[PDB]
RNA sequence: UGUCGAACGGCAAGUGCCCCGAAGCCAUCGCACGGUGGUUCUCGGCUGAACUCUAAGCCAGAAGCCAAUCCCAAGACCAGAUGCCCAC
């Protein structure tokens, strides 16, 4: 029924610089800044040192608690790669 | 037509009949007026986990509902505001 699988993690380099107050992530670079909400089921957002590592544990699982960990995975790398990356959009049209 | 002696003037015909008739009332027979904000779902879609719309994070919008304009109004008992004032 329930289980436990893994933990996720992601590290921050220089340039960029998370926080975790009030469980929420801030994320700044030299190209861009950008802030955002994360909350869901076992998913407490705590990040260790201030530029040490981004982990977000959780204590219970199943297919929904644990199909929801890493999409904030996904949701905070783009944090902190938008921050000095930074992604394009580009549009056409024909005639 | 009848009728007051006859005109004048009326009157009777439960308003004689007729033409016109203000006022009032009234006609899709006349006339004026009745084009507003949110909210969500269909939905186009975003990120991507575990590649796509959604599992969490999400814009967006027709109706829809919801108030609002509108009609009623505290037996919703208004410690709403306010005017005025007694005897004992």
């Given amino acids: 029924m329930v289980k ?3 933990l996720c993690t992601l ?6 610089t998370v926080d975790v107050k009030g469980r929420k992530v801030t994320v700044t670079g030299k190209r861009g800044t950008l802030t ?3 909350t869901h089921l076992q998913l407490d957002l ?3 040192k201030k530029n040490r590592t981004f982990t977000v544990i959780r204590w219970f699982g199943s297919k929904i608690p644990i199909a929801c960990l890493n999409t904030t995975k996904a949701h905070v790398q783009n944090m902190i790669t938008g921050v000095t990356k930074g992604y394009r ?3 056409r049209c024909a005639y």
């Fill in 36 to 38: 955002k909400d994360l």
């Fill in 46 to 48: 705590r990040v260790d």
């Fill in 4 to 6: 436990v699988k893994s």
């Fill in 11 to 16: 590290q921050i380099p220089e340039g960029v």
């Fill in 89 to 91: 959009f580009k549009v």
